[PDB]
Design a binder for this molecule. Structure first.
Ligand SMILES: Nc1ncnc2c1ncn2[C@@H]1O[C@H](COP(=O)(O)OP(=O)(O)NP(=O)(O)O)[C@@H](O)[C@H]1O
Ligand SMILES: Nc1ncnc2c1ncn2[C@@H]1O[C@H](COP(=O)(O)OP(=O)(O)NP(=O)(O)O)[C@@H](O)[C@H]1O
Ligand SMILES: OC[C@H]1O[C@](O)(CO)[C@@H](O)[C@@H]1O
Lengths: 296, 301
């Protein structure tokens, strides 16, 4: 039971690096271009792998040349893809990403290809004895709340020394997803969500939202160059300053780098304070680099 | 496979992967949005022209630069989907196969474009030296790296000097961007296409103005051609007689991207079949006008 599993989206990121964001109805040349395997859960596996944690990914992919690229990338990272929910309806999602090389800003135009989401049916088919931690990227809530319950069930049946740790990401300001707050030992909530609920800082968001998590859970809110905060059962607010690189050149996947790093640190036994900090340390480092290579 | 002597039309130029996203509204910097639709397309002038030539029923080949990879794979498969011979591609060990990002605003039609990077080397004159020409009856060059392309043209001229009239390779050139370096290309080719956009930048306000004002720059005996959107197109040859065809407006205008390339390929095709310049202008306007009412190149027949 020593593999981390991330459940969520995997998409092909077609990326252009520009030195200024283009005004509407204008035309500008890009400095360079590349393809990356992206999606939150997928980006997190990249990071876990680079950190040395055996991990595996689970999500929908449609057979094709794109998927072939993605799988190859997964494999080069040593990510287990065996639990992938292969399909026959829909395309694999992709996006156009513009990365502003002058400040690391990233603009994402996303194509969700109707590809049907992973289901409780698919999940129930998974040998949970393989995993020390399961992270779930909040997408199809009603169908994921089910997967969560299945995980609780498995836990109710296990020595505390052998329970599967669970984390949840709530990233889009979307009603259906809020039911997810109520599950998992660790809950990640985004600045975008927090702002959409009227909160103007990580600390205010944590106070405002801790009521929604389940007893014993740690709530976590990262906030870009403000670093990140966390709040546990004891009611003590925890904070970490960011580690901004002198030149921020690419923030695409910083959030996923942070989540992966917190999970890793926690799974390794560290305190929440220490994990917050390691999360920022690794995410800040990634912001100084194009892509993920070399955060290690 | 075996390609019969003097059977193919070659187009030398750019091929690019265009990623096209339709959106409700232009994305603000550092935001994430869902598009209404997104499309991968093969683009580029020489590339577009090859597609049209194939649909017209001509054997045709593309020569341009690519680098091994998944972008080139998509592009090669799309070429072949259109019956284009890719065996003359100049494969590169350095650089990125061109790809461009285009964002189309659905609620005002605007197009915001991030152009491909500059990393890939253009086809060089030494690259072109290695090509056996006997295969081709017509070679068309999209003006890009002009100093190198001038050498390619001189090489074609040398080949022709030694041939009987019935095995001379016909040559055409396109000058599509207003850049001074490209202008030396006017001096090569039996047929020179100049775009309205270049004409305008030089200060000409019509096709008639452009042809009379630029004809001086072409080599003796050459035909100079200029299409002008809804005004159709003109041509001027050595006999000094300005030739013209009106446009053939379609029931409604759906997509004019690549109309110029459709026009170019169609004129080349017609002339390659031995039609008169006047017949070719007309045919070019008919095919391109038809194309303006269709999305893409399907059904231009
Ligand atoms: N400009 C920055 N400087 C330093 N650290 C940063 C910066 N932006 C993000 N980080 C770090 O990454 C964490 C998450 O930031 P966040 O703004 O949620 O990332 P994100 O860019 O939204 N990820 P993504 O959705 O792929 O773009 C922050 O808590 C910091 O640790
Ligand atoms: N709006 C139109 N209606 C009819 N025919 C058109 C139209 N636009 C272009 N064409 C035809 O396409 C030929 C080439 O026109 P050209 O101006 O080079 O097109 P383009 O620059 O590729 N696209 P656009 O600038 O939007 O017209 C013209 O000579 C016409 O035959
Ligand atoms: O939401 C989809 C997008 O979000 C990211 O995962 C960034 O976290 C990109 O890789 C992907 O295109």
């Amino acid at each position: 039971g020593s593999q981390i599993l991330c459940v969520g989206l995997v998409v092909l990121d077609v990326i252009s690096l520009v030195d200024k964001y283009p005004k509407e109805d204008s035309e500008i040349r890009c400095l360079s271009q590349r393809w990356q395997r992206g999606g939150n859960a997928s980006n997190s596996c990249t990071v876990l792998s680079l950190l040395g944690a055996p991990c595996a990914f689970m999500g929908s992919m449609a057979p094709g040349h794109v998927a072939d690229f993605l799988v190859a990338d997964f494999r080069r990272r040593g990510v287990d893809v065996s639990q992938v929910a292969w399909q026959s309806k829909g395309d694999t999602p992709s996006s156009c990403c513009i990365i502003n090389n002058s400040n690391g800003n990233r603009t994402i135009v996303l194509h969700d290809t109707s590809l049907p989401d992973v289901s409780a049916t698919d999940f129930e088919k998974v040998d949970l004895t393989q995993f020390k931690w399961i992270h779930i990227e909040g997408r199809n809530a009603s169908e994921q709340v089910k997967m969560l319950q299945r995980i609780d069930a498995h836990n109710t049946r296990q020595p505390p020394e052998q329970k599967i740790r669970v984390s949840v990401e709530v990233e889009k300001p979307r009603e259906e997803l809020f039911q997810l707050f109520g599950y998992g030992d660790v809950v990640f909530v985004s600045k975008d969500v927090a702002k959409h609920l009227g909160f103007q800082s990580a600390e205010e968001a944590l106070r405002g939202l801790y009521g929604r998590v389940r007893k014993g859970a740690v709530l976590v809110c990262a906030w870009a160059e403000e670093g990140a905060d966390a709040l546990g059962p004891d009611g003590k607010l925890l904070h970490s300053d960011a580690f901004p690189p002198p030149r921020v050149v690419d923030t695409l996947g910083a959030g996923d780098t942070f989540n992966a790093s917190v999970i890793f640190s926690l799974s390794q036994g560290r305190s929440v304070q220490e994990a917050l900090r390691f999360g920022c340390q690794v995410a800040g480092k990634k912001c100084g680099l194009q892509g993920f290579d070399g955060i290690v």
